[PDB]
Design a protein around this ligand. Structure first.
Ligand SMILES: *[C@@H]1O[C@H](CO)[C@@H](O[C@@H]2O[C@H](CO)[C@@H](O[C@@H]3O[C@H](CO[C@H]4O[C@H](CO)[C@@H](O)[C@H](O[C@H]5O[C@H](CO)[C@@H](O)[C@H](O)[C@@H]5O[C@H]5O[C@H](CO)[C@@H](O)[C@H](O)[C@@H]5O)[C@@H]4O)[C@@H](O)[C@H](O[C@H]4O[C@H](CO)[C@@H](O)[C@H](O)[C@@H]4O[C@H]4O[C@H](CO)[C@@H](O)[C@H](O)[C@@H]4O)[C@@H]3O)[C@H](O)[C@H]2NC(C)=O)[C@H](O)[C@H]1NC(C)=O
Ligand SMILES: Cc1nnc(-c2cccc(C3=Nc4ccc(-c5ccccc5F)cc4NC(=O)C3)c2)o1
Ligand SMILES: [Ca+2]
Ligand SMILES: [Cl-]
Ligand code: NA
Ligand code: NA
Ligand SMILES: [Zn+2]
Length: 808
């Protein structure tokens, strides 16, 4: 119940929300159907429109008007935004040449530059260039301030997951808004765009920017706006708040536009109807900047122009129907569209089996436009699994397509020409970032980055301590003139042992064999040096990775590679090696095909054994340092050490073998040498974080050899590829991957063909940031480079996306 009988007199767009049943006057009262009876009359005035005209200049104040052009309007803070232009001979902000803002120029009583976030729904990154001719204000922000060619959203590329990621710095799996539609089985409640369940605080996790601010004594405008409040009135309201007394005035504000998403859905991303909505958005930006100039704030406020996600061409006719795949379509519930999420329709159905559903959806039609996954098998870069609201079965839908349960869902539930929600590396889903103001840099372009990084920066801009989040604080310091955040490298927690030769061959009973009894004070002194680390500077280019948890491990040196060997997991945490542009690939000699050699630096009790692999009929093994890239026949024997062996399903060995034999050399050729760090990952609870030993769900049968869920590689080279990887003076270039260690290649529909037709495609789908690998392993990479730490944090958040150019 609401008692709408109260009044909004002097309360229009009040900042504190009053408790029911008292009637509300804040910018969300409409959405809750709780506004006081006079809200429209008093707070949503429209009389005479939004612009001053010559004949209103000096007019006598009439409080009925939407905005004012009377002499007293500046001190009241409620002039139309073009007042000084029309009535006082001033220029529009967009018509002034841009002048660097070297320091904040703020009026007396301003304790810090305010922050204004101007957020636009469905603003595809390519609009900045393709629409630049009709968006002069936005183009001025862009060219004069700091901009990215694009900003990466989170998956799914839907509105509320991305807006709330922007507000919290968290992946959707962590903040809880994992889609625009959701079912939470613990609450037994559904979240919908339409209705009142979505207002319940329980859905919304983490700590959003407006709460972080308020707890630290920084006041915030209310970020949300009821759809019916026109944009002009949103802007006037913000400008009025900025004229409040110092002690009452917020320091952070948000404007939100439903455009261009609204029209994009109807007309497609570049439908000719899309020009007008872009013009109108620009006009709104102009109104803000003009109003700021009027208040003498245009060289004081930091403005962020940011989108949530892009927009792709999608039509009714590009829909896949689960009824064409499944026999039992009515036993399932499907969350449909640009992603699919499937669960059982009834928890009382004992014949529901996810394995049979997945199989019926796997590679069934030649040009099938979606692919099914158990969520723990989704690309780890999506970070989309660790939440009870994310159904076990997920469908990744190809760009330009939909999935639905049955055809009647699509006509009796054509219309639409655009949609979004696809994989967040897709070019059409990318969105925008521009920062302008004293704290941002001047005429600076920065590389694309992920929207999860922005919360930290918005906190830096306001002097706030960020709540714990998924950004890497410092990775965006290069966007800022001042207020950078200067982190220290984390402390190493475990120091390595450096074992020498401590065991005789006969102490081992691993059931291994090797034909290596073939064999000089020359290269015997020399191989002793190699085992003591004499070539380590070549193969460990950026320092040893630091182990950031308590464990027991050994550094092992070799001619061609160096490793950190875990006595707990019985395998390397990491193996590091450098392959020059000139390196030659060789074979595994016939007599060494099944060679595995005891490592006399490591006890039998801390070694794998070959008998376990013989007896486990499902499991084989591979090597981290590839025998194919040995520097010489004699060095190749090091590659067959038991301490370089890792457990691999035969199906996976196909992928790994092709990576090691073909691709590494290819990358060394293309990049002028590469440094490779490879290793296992264990994430059985799919939380994105290194498993402890007691979370491991599978071992090589009969043994304590844990089975990885994933294998990673970090491949580093010189950004200036005229320098070799091992003699690089400047910035680095990286690409990484986290490959699922699966017992089949069902993920790859063409896997019966030659690896040259499918393996690389798989690896591109599983591209990763170095930072993702850090979470998954508890390792810290790049500790000893000649680069600044912030630059290195940027490198660690890099994602190599293998998408074509944005714009063609
Ligand atoms: C991205 O960044 C985020 C944030 O930094 C990272 O997430 C953090 O990860 C930590 C490790 O997973 C985790 O720490 C745990 O906190 C538990 C208390 O959490 C509550 O309080 C906090 C603080 O305000 C709050 O933020 C939490 O919010 C979660 O849950 C609410 C609902 O209750 C949601 O609204 C919200 O969206 C959020 O959900 C998300 O996180 C939870 C996990 O907390 C997931 O389950 C959801 O799916 C969703 O992803 C909570 O309200 C604390 O209790 C934990 O302590 C246990 O584990 C420690 C380990 O040290 C152990 O020593 C203890 O004994 C204890 O175990 C006991 O409980 C077990 C389970 O019942 C039981 O098995 C044992 O036997 C014991 O009884 C733990 O310290 C932290 O909460 C989250 N924070 C957030 C905001 O998500 C995330 O890792 C980053 N991602 C990547 C890839 O890096
Ligand atoms: C509680 C609650 N339950 N439902 C609603 C509700 C109802 C109607 C609209 C909205 C909207 N919310 C957001 C969310 C995030 C940001 C944002 C943008 C950039 C950077 C940081 C940010 F936080 C701006 C927003 N403003 C809007 O107007 C859209 C929300 O609120
Ligand atoms: Ca884990
Ligand atoms: Cl109302
Ligand atoms: Na085997
Ligand atoms: Na296959
Ligand atoms: Zn939309």
């Amino acid at each position: 119940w609401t008692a709408t009988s109260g009044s909004c007199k002097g309360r229009c767009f009040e900042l504190q929300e009053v408790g029911p049943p008292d009637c509300r006057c804040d910018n969300l009262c409409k959405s809750y159907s709780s506004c006081c009876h006079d809200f429209d009359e008093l707070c949503l005035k429209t009389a005479r429109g939004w612009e001053c005209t010559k004949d209103r200049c000096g007019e006598v104040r009439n409080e009925e008007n939407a905005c004012h052009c009377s002499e007293d309007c500046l001190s009241r803070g409620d002039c139309c935004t073009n007042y000084q232009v029309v009535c006082k001979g001033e220029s529009h902000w967009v018509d002034d040449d841009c002048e660097e803002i070297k320091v904040p120029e703020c009026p007396a009583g301003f304790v810090r530059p305010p922050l204004i976030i101007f957020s636009v729904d469905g603003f595809r990154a390519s609009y900045m260039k393709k629409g630049s001719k009709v968006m002069p204000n936005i183009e001025k922000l862009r060219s004069c301030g700091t901009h990215a060619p694009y900003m990466r959203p989170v998956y799914p590329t839907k509105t509320f997951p991305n807006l709330y990621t922007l507000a919290t710095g968290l992946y959707p799996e962590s903040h809880g808004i994992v889609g625009n539609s959701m079912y939470d089985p613990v609450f037994d409640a559904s979240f919908h765009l339409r209705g009142r369940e979505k207002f319940n605080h329980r859905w919304w996790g983490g700590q959003p920017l407006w709460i972080t601010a308020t707890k630290q004594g920084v006041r915030a405008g209310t970020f949300f706006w009821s759809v019916s409040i026109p944009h002009e009135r949103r802007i006037l309201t913000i400008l009025q708040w900025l004229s409040l007394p110092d002690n009452e005035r917020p320091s952070v504000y948000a404007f939100y536009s439903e455009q261009p998403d609204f029209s994009g859905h109807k007309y497609g991303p570049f439908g000719p109807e899309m020009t007008n909505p872009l013009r109108e958005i620009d006009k709104t930006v102009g109104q803000l900047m003009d109003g700021l100039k009027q208040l003498r704030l245009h060289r004081c406020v930091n403005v962020i122009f940011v989108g949530d996600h892009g927009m792709e061409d999608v039509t009714c006719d590009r829909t896949e129907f689960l009824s064409n795949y499944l026999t039992n379509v009515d036993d399932i519930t499907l969350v449909p569209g640009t992603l699919g999420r499937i669960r059982a329709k009834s928890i009382n159905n004992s014949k529901y089996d996810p394995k049979t559903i997945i199989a019926a959806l796997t590679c069934k039609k030649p040009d099938q436009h979606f692919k099914p996954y158990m969520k723990q098998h989704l690309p780890k870069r999506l970070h989309y699994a660790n939440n009870r609201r994310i159904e076990d079965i997920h469908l990744l839908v190809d760009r330009r397509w939909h999935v639905a349960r049955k055809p009647l869902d699509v006509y009796k539930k054509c219309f639409f020409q655009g949609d979004h929600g696809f994989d967040n590396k897709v070019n059409s889903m990318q969105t925008v970032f521009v920062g302008y103001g004293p704290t941002f840099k001047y005429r600076t372009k920065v590389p694309p980055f992920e929207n999860i990084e922005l919360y930290n920066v918005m906190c830096d801009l306001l002097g706030l301590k960020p709540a714990p989040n998924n950004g890497t604080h410092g990775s965006l310091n290069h966007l800022l003139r001042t207020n950078t955040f200067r982190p220290t490298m984390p402390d190493e927690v475990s120091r390595p042992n450096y074992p020498g030769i401590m065991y005789l061959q006969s102490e081992f009973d691993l059931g291994c064999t090797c034909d290596d009894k073939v064999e000089n004070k020359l290269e015997e002194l020399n191989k002793r040096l190699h085992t003591k680390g004499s070539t380590k500077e070549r193969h460990l280019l950026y320092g040893r990775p630091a182990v950031l948890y308590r464990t027991s491990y050994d550094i092992l040196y070799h001619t061609d590679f160096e490793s950190g060997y875990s006595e707990i997991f019985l395998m390397p945490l990491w193996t590091s090696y450098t392959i020059s542009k000139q390196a030659e690939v060789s074979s595994i000699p016939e007599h060494l095909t099944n060679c595995v050699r005891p490592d006399v630096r490591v006890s039998p009790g801390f070694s794998q054994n070959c008998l376990a692999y013989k007896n486990d009929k499902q499991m084989s093994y591979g090597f981290l340092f590839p025998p194919y890239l040995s520097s010489s026949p004699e060095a190749k024997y090091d590659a067959f050490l038991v301490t370089n062996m890792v457990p691999m399903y035969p199906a996976f060995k196909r992928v790994w073998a092709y990576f090691q034999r073909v691709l590494v050399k290819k990358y060394a050729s293309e990049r002028n040498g590469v440094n490779v760090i490879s290793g296992p990952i264990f994430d059985y609870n799919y939380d994105g974080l290194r498993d402890t030993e007691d979370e491991i769900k599978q071992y090589v049968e009969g043994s304590s050899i844990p089975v990885p869920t994933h294998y990673y590689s970090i491949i580093t080279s010189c950004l200036d590829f005229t320098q070799p990887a091992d003699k690089c003076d400047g910035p680095l270039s990286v690409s990484s991957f986290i490959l699922p260690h699966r017992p089949d290649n069902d993920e790859s529909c063409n896997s019966s063909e030659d690896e040259s037709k499918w393996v690389e495609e798989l690896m591109k789908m599983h591209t990763a940031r170095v930072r993702d690998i850090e979470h998954l392993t508890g390792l810290d990479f790049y500790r000893k480079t000649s680069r600044s730490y912030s630059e290195i944090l940027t490198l660690k958040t890099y994602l190599h996306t293998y998408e074509s150019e944005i714009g063609g």
